[PDB]
Curated annotation (Swiss-Prot):
Subunit record text: In the ovaries, part of a complex composed of at least Panx, nxf2, piwi and Nxt1. The complex is knowns as Panx-induced cotranscriptional silencing (PICTS) complex, Panx-nxf2-dependent TAP/p15 silencing (Pandas complex), SFiNX (silencing factor interacting nuclear export variant) or piwi-Panx-nxf2-p15 (PPNP) complex. Interacts (via TAP-C domain) with Panx (via NIR region); the interaction is direct. Interacts (via NTF2 domain) with Nxt1; the interaction is direct and prevents Nxt1 binding to nucleoporins. Interacts with sbr/Nxf1.
Transmembrane segments: none
Assigned protein family: Belongs to the NXF family.
Annotated S-S bridges: none
Summary of the tissues where the protein is detected: Expressed in female gonads (at protein level). Expressed ubiquitously.
Designated name of the protein: Nuclear RNA export factor 2
Domain TAP-C: 6-59
Result after altering residue 41 to A: Reduces binding to Panx
Native species: Drosophila melanogaster
UniProt subcellular location: Cytoplasm; Nucleus; Nucleus, Nucleoplasm
The protein's role, per its UniProt record: May be involved in the export of mRNA from the nucleus to the cytoplasm. In the ovaries, forms a complex with nxf2, piwi and Nxt1 which acts as effectors of cotranscriptional transposon silencing. On recruitment to a target transcript, interacts with single stranded RNA, thereby anchoring the complex via the nascent target transcript to chromatin and allowing Panx to recruit silencing effectors to establishing repressive heterochromatin at transposon loci. Does not affect piRNA biogenesis. The interaction with Panx stabilizes the nuclear protein complex.
Domain notes: The RNA-binding domain is a non-canonical RNP-type domain. The TAP-C domain (also known as UBA domain) mediates the interaction with Panx.
Effect of gene knockout: Results in sterility where fewer eggs are laid and none reach larval stage. Increases transposon expression. RNAi-mediated knockdown in the germline does not affect ovary morphology but results in severe fertility defects where eggs are laied but do not hatch. RNAi-mediated knockdown in the germline increases transposon expression and impairs Panx localization in nurse cells by reducing its stability.
């Protein structure tokens, strides 16, 4: 459809905003999770624990947080959103 690419852009940015990952890993994880926001967050957390997310996958804004602290913040944000998704389902 003529709107499909704008929807895909949005789903990528949804995940990118939560995780703070560069677009390269946003594409990789979102596509592997078949474009599902919740599954992509879970997949990011699993890949992170398995040492499959390089330091350079974490976006920056100047050189500021270390790569280790960017990683911890990204995981924490993804885990909080997953909790919010579960809490919204329960209501």
């Amino acid at each position: 459809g003529p709107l499909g690419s704008d929807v895909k852009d949005h789903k990528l940015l949804l995940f990118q905003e939560v995780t703070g990952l560069i677009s390269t890993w946003v594409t990789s994880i979102v596509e592997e999770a078949d474009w599902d926001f919740e599954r992509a967050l879970k997949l990011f957390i699993q890949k992170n624990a398995d040492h499959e997310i390089p330091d350079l996958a974490f976006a920056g804004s100047g050189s500021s947080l270390s790569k280790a602290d960017k990683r911890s913040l990204a995981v924490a944000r993804a885990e909080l959103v997953l909790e919010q998704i579960q809490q919204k389902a329960n209501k």
